[PDB]
């Protein structure tokens, strides 16, 4: 690992601390009274694909 850069980078990634807040960009709260469907149109396709 000391003479190889890729394995060293793998070890570095495995050591460094990473929280959810680091990768998160924005969080939102929405009102949706239908458990099996949704009001948002952008995500409607993906969630209906999941449920089906």
């Amino acid at each position: 690992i000391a003479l190889d850069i890729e394995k060293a980078k793998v070890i570095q990634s495995s050591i460094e601390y990473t929280t959810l807040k680091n990768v998160t960009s924005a969080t939102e709260i929405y009102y949706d009274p239908d458990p099996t469907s949704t009001v948002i149109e952008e995500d409607f396709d993906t969630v209906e694909a999941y449920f089906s």
Binding site: T24, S25, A26, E28, I29
Partner: protein, 111 residues
């Protein structure tokens, strides 16, 4: 953005009906209740870019301490302009320039 009560000017907190399954903005100081238009109750930006270009005034061309360039205006193609960096002053802030024309007074970049 949050709305205010139309009768006693207090804040309209969101409320949910168990029987009707609707989102309603209701004032806790009275019985007033108005139907909500959007379900976006709350939004938090961990990384934000607001205030970077929001610090702009319409009289910034009268400041004598600002540098003057000859960059081309995208709208009226003037030959004089005034530039400055980002008004946000965090440690992560970029060093990109904002140019202001002396005729249309709009803010535009160089990219």
């Amino acid at each position: 953005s949050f709305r205010f009560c139309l009768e006693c000017n207090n804040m309209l907190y969101p409320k949910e009906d168990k029987e009707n399954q609707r989102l309603l903005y209701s004032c806790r100081n009275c019985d007033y209740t108005e139907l909500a238009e959007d379900p976006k109750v709350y939004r938090h930006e961990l990384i934000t870019n607001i205030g970077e270009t929001a610090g702009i005034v319409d009289d910034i061309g009268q400041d004598p301490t600002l540098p003057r360039s000859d960059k081309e205006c995208p709208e009226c193609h003037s030959r004089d302009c005034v530039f400055f960096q980002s008004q946000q002053r965090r440690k992560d802030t970029n060093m990109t320039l904002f140019y202001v024309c002396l005729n249309c007074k709009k803010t535009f970049r160089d990219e």
